[PDB]
């Protein structure tokens, strides 16, 4: 009748915004070569193939990437399995000995500062009472002059004795498929023009996310997932000059980077079973490692990012690019991994042009560090061992990280300078499309129906 | 219908439809509420959070008018101050997402009226099957 009655309906699909843990997945291809040759193979499970991607209708869901969850716990998760791939390797506390060190046997010119220091030292042997005199090659970003005579020490040794990487474990990223536990769901926005926040008007629930590769970079986030058609910037908000304007573009820029110094691995036994690895002899011709990008794709992609960066500032705006501005070494360069080696390459020669409102290759030099201090903790160093051969790798530049300078009082030039800073913004471009929700069933709704007594 | 002309029965599959369309596919949100070093502690606390949420909803369902019935009527009439809508505009036009925002302020009074209605009806069944 007119006196309607409540029914409890169970399993109404509605959702609310929530905060929870997530859960891994990876391919089957990672388990073919097996048992911790790369990380997370004893950690988390194989996926279901073909992620069940269900598009919805007539739903507007409010997305936000900057107050988002799940990008924090990837930043804890990578650090946690980084520690889990560094626990059972060998501590290198007997290495910190006073070095007797000299130049490598090279034709020295006065302008070029030598990148190799050939140090020899005392080291214990397998028997504790005999000791051996051994020699090694080191890079000048890993050795300091302690105070005629030139005796040197390793740079970490007044902070913490620290840990060699095992050469079993590799460093290339396998993709991680993030996936939802029972009782939550993962929503994906699928608009092309989408700058971060507000209503997305076409959503899709998914079971697991797509292929996300955790690849560390400071500037120039690389092997990342492209946009759909245009070039898009994204921001927390633009006029604040503290949060990183991050730009993502469609066609990649192919970047070839290489070390040509042919290296020899040498094993020294520290004591019982502590196989220390060092550089042996440098054969071939000693050079500096370097990155290469093609000129025409760089000029055209910089034209596209200044075209889509002029929309937020007015059309009569002179936009130039400078290089990075200061700070320590792992924010002035872009710093990246290639095949088991670390590179720190000075990107002055990319970000230097102005623009007006009306065969060909760029090279850039690059230094090699060996003690890294990843995520800037106190008592940690990862020692990379050195690899044989000329090392080269190609990659895809996709997205850049830019912070402004505080351009003030009316003059319409606005500088942009690349400098990455925080580690999270190489993941937040990779994960700007999902949010997590909690299903709350038991809706309550009226009808014209009364229960029999 | 189904198949090539289907509003999609998938997981959360018709979530923007009208509530008359979502009144059919209702087990599809029920049955995906169970399934699913230091990492196993996180995994096990995910699964026991899942079954603790599901047990709290089964226990909250059961002490009202229905044990596990999944479509469940009761004996408290509907108030005009909760919605002031007609039946046809919520069964022919409105979505469940928009319904849950229209009646979010009117929660935790309906559950109290459900508890009193079921508890007084259970004591009415107790005295009705007592005196005969």
């Amino acid at each position, epitope marked *: 009748a007119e006196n309607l009655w409540v029914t409890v309906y169970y399993g109404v699909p509605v959702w609310k915004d929530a905060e929870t843990t997530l859960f891994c997945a990876s391919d089957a291809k990672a388990y073919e070569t097996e048992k911790h040759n790369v990380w997370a193979t004893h950690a988390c499970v194989p996926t279901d193939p073909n992620p*069940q991607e*269900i*598009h919805l209708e007539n739903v507007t869901e409010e997305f936000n990437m900057w107050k988002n969850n799940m990008v924090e716990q990837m930043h804890t998760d990578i650090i946690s399995l980084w520690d889990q791939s560094l626990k059972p390797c060998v501590k290198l506390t007997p290495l910190c000995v006073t070095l007797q060190c000299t130049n490598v046997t090279n034709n020295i010119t006065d302008d070029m500062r030598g990148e190799l220091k050939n140090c020899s030292f005392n080291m214990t042997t397998e028997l504790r009472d005999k000791k051996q005199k051994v020699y090694s090659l080191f890079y000048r970003l890993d050795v300091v002059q302690i105070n005629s005579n030139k005796e040197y020490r390793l740079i970490n040794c007044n902070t913490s004795a620290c840990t060699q990487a095992c050469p079993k474990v590799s460093f290339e990223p396998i993709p991680i498929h993030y996936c939802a536990p029972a009782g939550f769901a993962i929503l994906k926005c699928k608009d092309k023009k989408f700058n971060g926040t507000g209503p997305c008007p076409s959503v899709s629930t998914v079971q697991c996310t797509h292929g996300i590769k955790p690849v560390v970079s400071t500037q120039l986030l690389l092997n990342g997932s492209l946009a759909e058609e245009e070039v898009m910037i994204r921001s927390e908000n633009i006029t604040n000059n503290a949060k990183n304007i991050l730009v993502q573009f469609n066609t990649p820029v192919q970047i070839n980077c290489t070390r040509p110094n042919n290296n020899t691995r040498k094993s020294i036994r520290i004591g019982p079973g502590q196989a220390f690895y060092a550089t042996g002899d440098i054969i071939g011709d000693i050079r500096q490692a370097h990155c290469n990008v093609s000129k025409a794709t760089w000029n055209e992609t910089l034209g596209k990012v200044v075209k889509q960066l002029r929309k937020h500032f007015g059309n009569n705006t002179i936009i130039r690019f400078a290089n990075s501005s200061g700070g320590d070494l792992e924010v002035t360069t872009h710093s990246f991994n290639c095949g088991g080696e670390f590179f720190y390459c000075n990107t002055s020669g990319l970000f230097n042009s102005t623009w007006i409102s009306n065969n060909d290759s760029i090279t850039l030099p690059c230094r090699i560090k060996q003690i890294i201090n990843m995520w800037q903790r106190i008592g940690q160093c990862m020692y990379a061992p050195p690899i044989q051969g000329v090392i080269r790798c190609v990659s895809n530049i996709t997205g850049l990280i830019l912070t402004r300078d505080g351009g003030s009082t009316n003059s319409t030039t606005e500088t942009f300078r690349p400098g990455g800073g925080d580690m999270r913004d190489n993941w937040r471009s990779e994960l700007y499309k999902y949010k997590v929700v909690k299903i709350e069933p038991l809706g309550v709704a009226p009808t014209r129906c009364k229960r029999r007594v | *219908a189904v*198949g090539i*002309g289907a509003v*999609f*029965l*998938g997981f959360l599959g018709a979530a923007g439809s009208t509530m008359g369309a979502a009144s059919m596919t209702l087990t599809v949100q029920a049955r995906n509420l169970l399934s699913g070093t230091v990492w196993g502690i996180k995994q096990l606390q995910a699964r026991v959070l899942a079954v603790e949420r599901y047990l709290r909803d089964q226990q909250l369902l059961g002490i009202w008018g229905c044990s596990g019935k999944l479509i469940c009527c009761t004996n408290v009439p509907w108030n005009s101050s909760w919605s002031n809508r007609n039946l046809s505009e919520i069964w022919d036009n409105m979505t469940w997402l928009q319904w849950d925002k229209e009646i979010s302020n009117y929660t935790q009074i309906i559950y109290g009226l459900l508890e009193e209605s079921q508890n007084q009806q259970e004591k009415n069944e107790q005295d009705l099957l007592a005196l005969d």
Partner: antibody
Amino acid sequence: VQLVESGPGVMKPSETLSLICAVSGDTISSPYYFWSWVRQPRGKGLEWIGGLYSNTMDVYYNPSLQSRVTISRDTSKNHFSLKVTSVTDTDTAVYYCARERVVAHNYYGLDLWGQGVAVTVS
Amino acid sequence: DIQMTQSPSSLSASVGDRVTITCRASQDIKNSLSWYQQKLGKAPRRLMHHSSTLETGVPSRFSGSGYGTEFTLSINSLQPEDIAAYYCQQYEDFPLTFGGGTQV
């Protein structure tokens, strides 16, 4: 983009009828595509075996032949497989795998079909 | 389970004709039939979905009408490639079932 099926059919009754359908040009992980296996013996009608969607889990058959037939689908080889156990002589037929649009979510699909293979069982 | 019945069965008409072929169901479907055209030894080329709007790549010489349960195909201009099989198929509930078979 073309669908290639495979499987020879000259076998004995009450046995392992196995058919593979695959895509060349595109992928099977594209969303919202009705997959179908439909057979037809010559002289007889167009008989429906199996049909599912591209992006869910729940699968469907004809109940009159359901203990004989099952289906499978995997994207690591992009395979769409029909299995029949316990055949009779009423499976000497041409067989078609088919990709159809779901018309509420897809105005831009290509209603794809396989060429159909002929299976003869003595 | 829903049965379908396609009437009539066998035809042979002259050129330029207008052939009509209807089919009926066992319960009410009201929006849901698709029409498929299968030549000899070939894959069935679909005429249409949802009985009133067509597929691209097929001209306006075919049509379907009806509402509810009985539905009807009409070809107003017969071409010589039309001597083949045709099928109406339901998509109301699982399983899908075709028509009987048109021998035109």
